[PDB]
Amino acid sequence: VHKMALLVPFRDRFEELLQFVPHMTAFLKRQGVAHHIFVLNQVDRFRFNRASLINVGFQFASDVYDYIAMHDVDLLPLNDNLLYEYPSSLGPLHIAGPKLHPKYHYDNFVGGILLVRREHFKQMNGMSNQYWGWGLEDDEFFVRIRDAGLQVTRPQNIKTGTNDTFSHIHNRYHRKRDTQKCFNQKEMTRKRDHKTGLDNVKYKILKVHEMLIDQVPVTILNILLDCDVNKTPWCDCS
């Protein structure tokens, strides 16, 4: 059978994580999905880089996981018909589709929760590394999906919709989105990145922690991401 690496980019969301772990373990257990949660704890001081943290988690995870779930820690599925299944040959399986997501509704939205076969993630050279702070990293990945001759599939015949498919417990004031721009960030991050990815994300895993949360095993990666300010100075706008 198949195994999912549940990759959870993470910084300063302990409260969310305590809700995430039990909810997801139970949910996935009901649909027979074998999996393991990898908390991608960014311990450098640069702005949050979700995509790069995913690259790291993918490298770390062993070949026994034949697919991954890039999974926001604050987004809980409320509908058991959302199948976190091995994606088809077509490409990524997007769980949090534009018609089910509480907040994002455009056609090619692939954020929130996105499942990708190991082989396809390698094909696409994983995600761009140039996204420091909120926004755009998932859209650039959409393009990587089309450029690889792949496509996005989403669950069919979900009866629930944008108000009752997911719990998105994320108060915009409690957890601020880091929308700042500095240096030439707008211009540069809006353009397709053919130069970086899985194969050159620069980092170190300082420490690996085996945690149990009410018996449920979970792996913490303390990831010190590196920034080349000659290429991506917007990693830090202070």
Ligand X SMILES: O=c1ccn([C@@H]2O[C@H](COP(=O)(O)OP(=O)(O)O)[C@@H](O)[C@H]2O)c(=O)[nH]1
Ligand Y SMILES: O[C@@H]1[C@@H](O)[C@H](O[C@@H]2CO[C@@H](O)[C@H](O)[C@H]2O)OC[C@H]1O
Amino acid identity of residue 32, one-letter, is G
Pairing of strands 35-42, 216-225: parallel
Which residues share a beta bridge with 113? Answer: 71
Name residues contacting ligand Y, limited to 90-149 (CB under 6 A). 104, 106, 109, 111, 135-136, 138-139
- Which partner from the list Mn ion, ligand Y, ligand X, none does 106 bind, CB cut-off 5 to 8 Å by kind? ligand Y
Closest distance between ligand X and the C-beta of residue 238, in Å? 15
Residue 143 token pair: 């393009």
List CB contacts of 127: < 8 A, sequence separation 6 or more: 51, 52, 54, 55, 137, 140, 141, 144, 197, 198
- Which partner from the list ligand X, Mn ion, ligand Y, none does 139 bind, CB cut-off 5 to 8 Å by kind? ligand Y
Q: Does 9 bind ligand X (CB under 6 A)?
A: yes
**Placement of tokens 């809006």 in the chain:** 190
Binding site residues, Mn ion, CB under 5 A: 74, 170
DSSP 128: -
First to last CA, the chain: 48
Closest distance between ligand X and the C-beta of residue 145, in Å? 18
Among 87, 111, 126, 155, binds ligand X (CB under 6 A): 111
Q: Does 177 bind ligand X (CB under 6 A)?
A: yes
Among 46, 52, 55, 72, binds ligand X (CB under 6 A): 72
Distance of CA 138 to the CA centre of its chain: 8
Query: What does each C-alpha distance from 47 to 14, 63, 233 come to in angstroms?
Result: 18, 30, 11
Pairing of strands 93-94, 113-117: antiparallel
Binding-residue total with ligand X (CB under 6 A):
16
Closest distance between ligand Y and the C-beta of residue 138, in Å? 5
* Residues in contact with ligand X by the rule CB under 6 A: 8-13, 48, 50, 72-74, 111-112, 134, 170, 177
* Residues in contact with ligand Y by the rule CB under 6 A: 104, 106, 109, 111, 135-136, 138-139
